[PDB]
């Protein structure tokens, strides 16, 4: 236990470095905390509140993506409080989410859909009318249908930190807080399809890939890119002998989680 | 003591609450401000921290957190960074005007408290984040700070005590969420008024990434009088663990809505019928009271009969003492309309950063509008209760809790009124 | 009614002539010196407020000028301007009446004040008189609740209002004078009507109640 | 020592530049500000 | 963002020719082992299966994500470049 602290996930002991978050300790144990706004290569935002978990001998659930474990914490992940918190947060997301799933590019690729089936309720009590947000025109690559946006600020954080353009942000307040650009500006830089990758909902989709196929149809062939000398690892998504899509692969020594616009 | 109330004017701290005397430097000096503050600063940070701890002053913001402990979180050696004191002069909570009154009428009290607290934690500067609508109050505060700077109380020698302190005033631009601690810190930092998560706490990473302490105007302004008159006197006022003197802002259906300075643990009936002139129509006409601003829930007349003005007493009454804003509603009040107006205020003032507050407070506003119209069924009351419980405790800051609490209080107390409205609507529409 | 998008119009294109006066540039320099070095991005709100005070409303050219002066991203400036409510992103009248309609003002009958203002100005809420003289909006709590009902016109509070009192206030503004702030019910500030229930004995002065050893 | 007259009338004759004029006036009374070592966070 | 599909080893085959049907334009194949995907709990188990079946195999080592240093307080730094300008 040299420069390490002992914590517990469901009573199972594990050594962690100081500064390790609850989510990181949980995935060290081998369980994946639900998330929408946390990305391991973006900065910590902590807004979507999907990662609320119950610590033993603690009354309030904590955000696993942001809270660092202190010492001896027993992270109850499948507890009643954690399940209730996940159900409530999923209910609040799907209250104003639009019924766009058949006409959406996130067919089987939707974190909102998958985490709904895995952690949320199976029905809704929302008897009111939903909101609608007009779409933007940020370029010929990223198609925006911003009614589907859940305001997780992943695109804003990516553009601020990795693309380094500072062009996206949240304008407004409350339920009317809109992600995008205030002016008619084109989000046209290199490394700009990675917002299509990291947007969990279908708010930011690919315009060449629009309405073409579905992820269950697409076969995944793991290949290397030749458009530059980086040699970024990619997945070619192919359906019926046709190249449909280019996605990145995780490789921490070459391209991490992203690929350029040329190869995408 | 057992019975609390009937405070003496010789014991009242805010001696010029009502604006009848001069608010300038000469008026503050005649009223007793800036007296022996050089001796206080030479006594130093540990003595002031012990004085506030033994005074037992709690946060006037509404959090209720012990001021001595909160200020003692910053009693650390410097790590190469400056340390800051920030004054929450927002005061966006409804029903509340006490911060505005003491800023515009005793601003030198606020400046002296800024100096004393900044010395208490160890600090170079106090940023006063004032509400942007309080333009006259902000200019008044700046005139007082100019008088202090010219008198040498602040700047390069803090009252001749070999201490460098600077008091700045920064104005908001109209956001109730900018009254929050971390959101106020972000607003000073120049971003939007969105609160940041804790940890890191402001005592470690705060404004500009420096250790800082955010404190209420009332807390800061009563700090130097606490230091001058001792913590024993302030602890003697009020009950155990709810000690001292509070500014109560009585508004609504009362004969004389007013801001008054009164001892803690005063009965609510005694306070209303002594200072407000009583409820319009009488105590029998009184229906409900929201006793701590809009974030605290409501209490009916039956428990209003014998309730005190403590944090602990209102928690036992299933409420809280927030900004000590006593909103009184008589029998003529549309109680569901008042609560729905409060929820509409929370919808307009939510910052929208985090999903439970954003979506749930909008949902609660829509359901409360339908409740006012009577356009729902009694199962939706339990549905709204569950929605409020999902909002409460799952949010980033306490605006979600402060918006879920009035709905909880209305459902807890005035449920037959809601059922009567729904039944009347169902009868007259079918 | 406000929309948090920008539509390119001839009155609000990024070519409307906006530039700070030299006095405003000196004030901007004072604000930047007020904030610490390396964190001049924290001066966005006072500089944007100064731009609004100079120009009336805030055009997109003013937003871009503030961004250029402070060397901060214009999208961050747009974030601040759209987040904060009292920044006027559309042109308003000379007198910007804001009627508080939160619950204690509603209890003290701010609705009658709103309806009399609507009938007097001939306009609804959120719109402007055709002579570009009065804009009338509803707002949340303005921090003066014991003086309910109350309005804010530009930077001045008008408190303890009656329909007659707000009628003479509108008449004074139309005549072009200063209606003077404060409550109109005879009380000077938040004091109780019909006498003082506290702070009647004069303050004691220096050296009163001082603990020993100080 | 009068206690029957309101004494905040100095706020009646305030223009729209009073706060910033006072800030510019107090700009000479302040300590030198700390620096982070860089011109901006970029 | 889910990682439940990266827990088990898999063995697939090299892609063969898919052509266009003259009548309907469907995808036609001449190889039977086109959709043959096998699941294994261990790399050595997959290698043993390939060796006992006599197929030539190409094995790729599992790429686990590196543990990241995540800190919410880094977003609000005094002097470092990690200070975010928005949320
Ligand atoms: C939505 C919201 C609004 C708040 N508004 C204020 C305010 O206007 N003034 C204030 O002093 N505290 C306000 N607070 C409470 C602050 O967290 C608290 O006052 C601050 O931490 C200072 O603590 P204190 O009470 O010990 O001075 C607000 C809190 C929330 C969640
Ligand atoms: S983003 Fe997901 S939940 Fe939303 S419409 Fe698309 S598939 Fe459905
Ligand atoms: S557009 Fe997508 S990535 Fe951006 S905040 Fe919305 S949901 Fe998140
Ligand atoms: S609780 Fe509401 S006001 Fe607070 S961070 Fe969340 S959205 Fe913003
Ligand atoms: S994943 Fe933690 S709040 Fe979003
Ligand atoms: S509720 Fe109207 S000023 Fe506060
Ligand atoms: K997407």
Q: Where are the domains of chain B?
A: 2-56, 57-236, 237-333, 334-429
Structure tokens at B132: 């942007």
Is B428 part of any known ligand binding site? no
SS (H, E, C) chain C: CCCCCCCCCCCCCCCCCCCCCHHHHHHHHHHHHHCCECCHHHHHHHHHHHHHHHHCCCCHHHHHHHHHHHCCCHHHHHHHHHHCCCCCCCCCCCEEEEEECCHHHHHCCHHHHHHHHHHHHCCCCCEECCCCCEEEEEECCCCCCCCCCCEEECCEEEECCCHHHHHHHHHHHHHCCCCCCEECCCCCCCCCCCCCCCCCCCCCCCCCCCCCCC
Q: Give first-to-last CA distance, chain C, whole Å.
A: 58
Question: How was this entry determined?
Answer: cryo-EM
Query: What is the architecture of the domain spanning B237-333?
Result: Roll (3.10)
CB atoms within 10 A of CB E69: 11
Chain D residues within 8 angstroms (CB to CB) of chain B? 2-8, 10-11, 14, 18-19, 22-23, 25-26, 29-31, 34, 36
Question: Does E67 lie at the interface with A, CB-CB under 8 angstroms?
Answer: yes
Strand partners, B326: B250
Structure tokens at C155: 């930077």
**Quick check: bond before B174 cis, omega within 30?**
no
Declared resolution, Å: 3.1
Kindly give the distance from the C-alpha atom of residue A97 to the centroid of ligand 5, in angstroms, as a whole number: 18
> Running DSSP on this structure, what letter comes out for residue E64?
P
A12 three-class SS: strand
- Token match 């914590």: residue? A7
**Buried (b) or exposed (e) across D7-17, using 16+ Cβ within 10 A?**
bbeebeebeeb
Question: How deeply is E5 buried, as exposed, middle or buried, from its count of CB atoms within 10 A (0-12, 13-18, 19+)?
Answer: exposed
**Distance set, CA C27 to CA C17, C24, D23 (Å):** 20, 5, 8
* Residue ranges per structural domain of chain C: 18-91, 92-197
What's the Rg (C-alpha) of chain B? 22
Kindly give the distance from the C-alpha atom of residue C23 to the centroid of ligand 6, in angstroms, as a whole number: 35
Question: Does A256 lie at the interface with E, CB-CB under 8 angstroms?
Answer: no
Is the distance from CB of C163 to CB of C119 less than 8 angstroms?
Answer: no
Chain A residue numbers touching E72 (CB-CB < 8 A): 44, 46, 66
Ligand 3 pocket test: pick from A37, A42, A49, A151 the residue with the most ligand atoms within 8 Å of its Cβ. Answer: A151
How far is the C-alpha of B304 from the C-alpha of B318, rounded, in Å? Answer: 12
**Buried (b) or exposed (e) across C177-187, using 16+ Cβ within 10 A?**
eebebbbbeeb
How far is the C-alpha of B350 from the C-alpha of B386, rounded, in Å? Answer: 20
- Give the H or E element holding residue B361: helix B355-373
Residue (of A155, A162, A167) closest to A255 by Cα position: A162
How far is the C-alpha of E24 from the C-alpha of A220, rounded, in Å? Answer: 25
Ligand nearest to the CA of B131: 1
Is the distance from CB of A174 to CB of A245 less than 8 angstroms?
Answer: no
Is the distance from CB of B325 to CB of C145 less than 8 angstroms?
Answer: yes
CATH number assigned to the domain covering B57-236: 3.40.50.11540
How far is the C-alpha of C194 from the C-alpha of C189, rounded, in Å? Answer: 13
Chain C residues within 8 angstroms (CB to CB) of chain D? 26-27, 29-31, 33-41, 46, 50, 53, 71, 154-155, 178, 180-182, 188-189, 200, 202
Chain A residue numbers touching E65 (CB-CB < 8 A): 40, 250, 252
Pairing, β B258-263 against β C134-139 = unpaired
Contact across the interface for B82 and D5, Cβ inside 8 Å: no
Structure tokens at A242: 């046709």
CB atoms within 10 A of CB C24: 18
- Token match 């059922």: residue? B419
For the CA of A202, the nearest atom of ligand 2: 1
Chain E residue numbers touching B186 (CB-CB < 8 A): 87
Structure tokens at C2: 């406000």
A16 three-class SS: strand
Pairing, β A142-144 against β A5-9 = unpaired
Contacts of E61 (CB under 8 A, 6+ apart): E43
* Residue ranges per structural domain of chain A: 2-213, 214-264
The crossing angle, in degrees rounded to 10, of helices B45-55 and B217-229 is 100
Kindly give the distance from the C-alpha atom of residue C127 to the centroid of ligand 3, in angstroms, as a whole number: 34
- Token match 């407004």: residue? A172
Could you give phi then psi for residue A201, rounded to 5 degrees?
Answer: -85, 175
Residue (of B243, A158, A115, B257) closest to E2 by Cα position: A115
Pairing, β B258-263 against β B245-252 = antiparallel
Contact across the interface for B139 and D25, Cβ inside 8 Å: no
Residue D14: closest CA among chain B residues belongs to which residue? B136
Pocket-forming residues, ligand 6, beta carbon under 6 Å: B 94; C 100, 102, 104-105, 141-145, 148, 150
Pairing, β A5-9 against β A12-16 = antiparallel
Angle in degrees, CA C87, C93, C99, rounded to 5? 70
What's the Rg (C-alpha) of chain E? 23
Class of domain B334-429: mainly alpha
């Amino acid at each position: 236990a040299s420069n390490l602290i002992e914590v517990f996930v469901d009573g199972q002991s594990v050594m962690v470095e100081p500064g390790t978050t609850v989510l990181q300790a949980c995935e060290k144990v081998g369980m994946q905390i639900p998330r929408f706004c946390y990305h391991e290569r973006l900065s910590v935002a902590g807004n979507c509140r999907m990662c609320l978990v119950e610590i033993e001998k603690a009354p309030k659930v904590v955000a696993a993506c942001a809270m660092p474990v202190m010492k001896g914490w027993n992270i109850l992940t499948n507890s009643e409080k954690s399940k209730k918190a996940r159900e409530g947060v999923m209910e609040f997301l799907l209250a104003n989410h639009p019924l766009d799933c058949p006409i959406c590019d996130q067919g089987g690729e939707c974190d909102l859909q998958d985490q709904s089936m895995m952690f949320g309720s199976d029905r809704s009590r929302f008897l009111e009318g939903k909101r609608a947000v007009e779409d933007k025109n940020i370029g010929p690559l990223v198609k925006t249908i911003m009614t589907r946006c859940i305001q997780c600020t992943r695109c804003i954080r990516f553009a601020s930190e990795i693309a380094g353009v500072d062009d996206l942000g949240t304008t407004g307040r409350g339920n009317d807080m809109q992600v995008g650009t205030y002016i008619e500006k084109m989000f046209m830089s290199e490394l700009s399809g990675n917002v299509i990758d990291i947007c969990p909902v279908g708010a930011l989709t690919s315009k060449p890939y629009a309405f073409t196929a579905r992820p269950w149809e697409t076969r995944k062939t793991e290949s290397i890119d030749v458009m530059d000398a980086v040699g970024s690892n990619i997945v070619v998504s192919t359906r019926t002998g046709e190249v449909m899509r280019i996605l990145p692969r995780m490789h921490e020594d070459i391209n991490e989680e992203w690929i350029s616009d040329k190869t995408r | 003591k057992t019975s609390f109330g009937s405070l003496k004017d010789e014991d009242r701290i805010f001696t010029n609450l009502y604006g009848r005397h001069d608010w300038r430097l000469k008026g503050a000096l005649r009223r007793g401000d800036w007296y022996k503050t050089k001796e206080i600063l030479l006594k130093g940070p540990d003595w002031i921290l012990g004085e506030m701890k033994t005074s037992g002053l709690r946060g006037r913001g509404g959090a209720g957190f012990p001021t001595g402990l909160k200020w003692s979180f910053m009693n650390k050696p410097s790590d190469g960074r400056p340390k800051y004191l920030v004054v929450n002069a927002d005061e966006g909570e409804p029903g509340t005007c006490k911060d505005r009154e003491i800023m515009r009428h005793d601003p030198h009290k606020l400046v002296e408290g800024c100096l004393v607290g900044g010395r208490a934690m160890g600090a170079r500067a106090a940023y006063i984040y004032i509400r942007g609508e309080f333009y006259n109050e902000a200019s008044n505060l700046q005139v007082a700070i100019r008088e202090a700077y010219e008198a040498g109380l602040i700047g390069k020698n803090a009252c001749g005590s070999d201490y460098d302190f600077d008091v700045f005033v920064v104005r908001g631009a109209g956001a109730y969420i900018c009254g929050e601690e971390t959101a106020l810190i972000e607003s000073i930092e120049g971003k939007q008024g969105k609160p940041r998560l804790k940890p890191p706490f402001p005592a470690d990473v705060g404004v500009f990434g420096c250790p800082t302490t955010v404190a209420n105007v009332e807390t800061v302004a009563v700090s130097p009088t606490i230091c001058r008159r001792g913590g024993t006197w302030f602890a003697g006022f009020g009950r155990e663990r709810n000690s001292g003197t509070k500014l109560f802002n009585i508004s609504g259906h009362v004969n004389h809505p007013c801001t008054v300075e009164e001892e803690m643990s005063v009965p609510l009936k005694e306070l209303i019928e002594k200072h407000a002139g009583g409820v319009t129509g009488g105590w029998d006409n009184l229906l409900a009271v929201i006793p701590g601003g809009s974030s605290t829930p409501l209490i009916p007349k039956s428990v209003c009969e014998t309730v005190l003005m403590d944090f602990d007493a209102l928690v036992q009454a299933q409420t809280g003492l927030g900004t000590a804003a006593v909103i009184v509603m008589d029998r003529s009040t549309d109680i569901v309309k008042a609560i729905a107006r409060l929820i509409e205020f929370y919808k307009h003032e939510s910052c929208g950063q985090c999903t439970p507050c954003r979506e749930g407070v909008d949902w609660m506003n829509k359901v409360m509008a339908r409740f006012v119209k009577g356009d729902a069924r009694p199962a939706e009351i339990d549905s709204l209760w569950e929605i409020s419980k999902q909002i409460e405790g799952h949010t980033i800051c306490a605006l979600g809790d402060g918006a879920a609490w009035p709905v909880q209080g209305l459902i807890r107390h005035f449920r037959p009124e809601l059922e009567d409205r729904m039944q009347r609507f169902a009868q007259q529409h079918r | 009614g406000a929309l948090f998008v920008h539509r390119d119009t001839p009155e609000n294109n990024p070519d409307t002539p906006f530039d700070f006066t030299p006095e405003n540039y000196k004030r901007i320099e004072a604000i930047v010196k007020n904030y610490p070095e390396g964190h001049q991005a924290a001066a966005v709100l006072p500089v944007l407020d100064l731009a609004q005070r100079q120009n009336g409303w805030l055009p997109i050219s003013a937003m871009n000028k503030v961004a250029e002066v402070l060397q901060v991203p214009p999208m961050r400036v747009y974030e601040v301007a759209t987040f904060y409510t009292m920044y006027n992103r559309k042109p308003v009248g000379k007198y910007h009446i804001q009627v508080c309609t939160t619950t204690p003002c509603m209890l003290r009958d701010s609705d009658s004040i709103l309806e009399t203002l609507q009938r007097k100005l001939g306009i609804k809420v959120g719109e402007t008189t055709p002579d570009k003289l009065f804009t009338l909006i509803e707002v949340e709590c303005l921090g003066a609740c014991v003086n309910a009902p109350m309005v804010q016109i530009n930077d001045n509070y008008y408190e303890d209002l009656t329909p007659k009192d707000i009628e003479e206030i509108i008449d004074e503004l139309k005549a072009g004078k200063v209606p003077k702030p404060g409550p109109r019910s005879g009380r000077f500030c938040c004091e109780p009507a019909g006498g003082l229930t506290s702070l009647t004995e004069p303050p004691k002065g220096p050296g009163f109640g001082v603990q020993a050893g100080l | 020592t009068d206690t029957t007259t309101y004494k905040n009338l100095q706020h009646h004759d305030y223009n729209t530049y009073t706060f910033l004029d006072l800030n510019l006036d107090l700009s000479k009374f302040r300590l030198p500000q700390p620096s982070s070592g860089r011109e901006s966070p970029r | 963002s889910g990682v439940n599909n990266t827990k088990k080893w898999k063995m697939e085959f090299d892609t063969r020719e898919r052509w266009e049907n003259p009548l309907m334009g469907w995808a036609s194949t001449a190889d039977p082992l086109s959709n043959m995907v096998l699941t294994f709990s261990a790399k050595e188990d997959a290698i043993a299966f390939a060796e006992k079946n006599g197929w030539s195999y190409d094995v790729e080592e599992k790429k686990v994500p590196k543990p990241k240093s995540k800190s919410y307080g880094a977003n609000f730094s005094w002097n470092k470049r990690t200070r975010v300008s928005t949320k």
